Amino acid sequence: SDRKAVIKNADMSEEMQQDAVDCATQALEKYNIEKDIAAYIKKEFDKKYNPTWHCIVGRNFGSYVTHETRHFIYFYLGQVAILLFKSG
Amino acid sequence: SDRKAVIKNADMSEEMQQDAVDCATQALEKYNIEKDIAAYIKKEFDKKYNPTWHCIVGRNFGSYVTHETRHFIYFYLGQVAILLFKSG
């Protein structure tokens, strides 16, 4: 990978943040379409860190969400922005 | 307003869908930044339809989310796409 990871806003353990970056790297190598990248990441996080996660992947969006404490990350990987958080 | 509403995917009562469009119309008239539009819509839906809602507003994004039955809408209003759903 030559993609630069830049974590913009996180409320999350360091190991979980690293796992989000690693998971997104695998998603981007397999899939080109944003919704497919998002589904890969969401499903992995549901498995490793319990339901219920939600994932948005894109180049132009804003958001207002509610998340469980310690289960939120917003980061860039290359030119793609990724929002990943747990609620409900 | 001259913005065209196109509901792409909804699991939601007709009246709630109309309220999402009306709320987003008010948000777009007041605010220019996607995150501020999203916050306006999320807060109105938490008030009218109970917590906990999440809102994404943008022109380029894909998503994979989990939502409570009958509480999901994805729609365009003008050139902006809006994802609004309840979870947790």
């Binding site: 969006f61 969400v65 404490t69 | 996607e34 995150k35």
Partner: peptide, 14 residues
Amino acid sequence: STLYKNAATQTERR
């Protein structure tokens, strides 16, 4: 609440 909080994100032009 200590169990949850709201968060905002906004992509930036680069």
